[PDB]
């Protein structure tokens, strides 16, 4: 493992943050894959450039490929072990939506101009041979907490068990350090949460808001975020880098948390989406989801697999 050769994966969720979800066309497959080839180049040759530029606004980025993109660019090559289609999830009292979707991005910077620029010089690649199908544009709330109000990413892993649980190891080496990112936005029902006090916000999350102190177990909700959230099969703990995002038209009222969680098992993420939604986590009740799709985060070099016409 090397996580030098990693996309963005695993660390710096940043201050200003766009989201970007994109179809092909499937009018053309020739052309359209000479495109997507074209890209996996200039991407790195933008990031290089805009990183010479400004050494010190941490740009960060990863670019995505969909199970239903794979089949249709590379239908005769080989595909990381755990990349299929998302197509939902039926739970409980709250259903998922799946979203069609082929290729994604997640730039991240400390300005919006390098979020702005990043995207804007892909697309001259990309805009003939695509529709876009969702564009979200993201930002770190004070002391990086959620739009909600509680801190976001405590019990994220960190340093060595970021590597650990973030990119593909030697299970799968055609794509070792790579990996597989959930995008899913949500919708908040900020009036309904507002009105709780804060000490029935502090029963749906696990933890105490100001200090962000975890609860307790004796003193937890059952349903709460932090307790139906986790994957613990075989008693091991299971993570993922989950690196959420508000999004907010504050005029018309109309806010959200973009979950995006990075794992070097698609399996952990789809277990603690299972979980959520079929025990019922109390902060479905202010959360509803309006899109998601899994994409596989290549490493660096089936990057240049691909730029090369190797798949
Ligand atoms: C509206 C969407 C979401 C919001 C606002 C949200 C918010 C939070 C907050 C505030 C925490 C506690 C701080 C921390 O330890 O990071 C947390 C923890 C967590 N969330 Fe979420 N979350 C959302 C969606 C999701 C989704 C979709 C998943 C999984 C697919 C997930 C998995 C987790 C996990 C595993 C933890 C850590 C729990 C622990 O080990 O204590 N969350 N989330």
Not at 232 to 251: A, Q, Y
Not at 268 to 276: F, G, I, P, Q, S
């Amino acid at each position: 493992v090397n996580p030098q050769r990693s996309q963005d994966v695993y660390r710096d969720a940043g201050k200003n943050v766009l989201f970007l979800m994109l179809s092909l066309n499937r009018q053309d497959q020739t052309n359209e894959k000479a495109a997507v080839e074209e890209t996996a180049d200039r991407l790195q040759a933008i990031k290089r450039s805009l990183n010479v530029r400004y050494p010190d606004s941490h740009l960060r980025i990863a670019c995505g490929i969909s199970s239903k993109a794979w089949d249709y660019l590379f239908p005769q090559a080989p595909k990381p072990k755990e990349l299929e289609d998302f197509t939902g999830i039926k739970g409980d009292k709250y259903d998922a939506p799946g979203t069609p979707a082929d290729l994604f991005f997640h730039v991240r910077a400390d300005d919006q101009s390098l979020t702005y620029e990043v995207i804007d010089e892909i697309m001259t690649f990309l805009r003939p041979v695509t529709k876009v199908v969702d564009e979200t544009h993201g930002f770190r709330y004070f002391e990086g907490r959620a739009i909600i109000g509680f801190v976001d990413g405590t019990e994220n892993p960190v340093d060595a068990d970021a590597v650990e649980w973030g990119i593909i190891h030697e299970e799968d080496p055609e794509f070792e350090n790579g990996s597989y990112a959930f995008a899913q936005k949500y919708l908040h029902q900020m009036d309904a949460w507002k009105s709780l006090s804060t000490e029935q916000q502090e029963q749906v999350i696990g933890r105490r808001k100001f200090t962000d102190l975890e609860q307790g177990d004796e003193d937890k909700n059952q349903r709460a975020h932090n307790v139906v959230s986790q994957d613990n099969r075989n008693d091991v703990e299971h993570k993922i880098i989950r690196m959420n995002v508000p999004f907010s038209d504050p005029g018309e009222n109309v806010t959200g948390t973009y979950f995006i969680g990075y794992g070097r098992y698609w399996d952990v993420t789809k277990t603690m989406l299972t979980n959520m939604f079929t025990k019922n986590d109390l902060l479905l009740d202010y959360s509803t989801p309006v899109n998601g799709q899994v994409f596989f985060i290549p490493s660096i070099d089936t990057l240049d697999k691909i730029a090369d016409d190797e798949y």
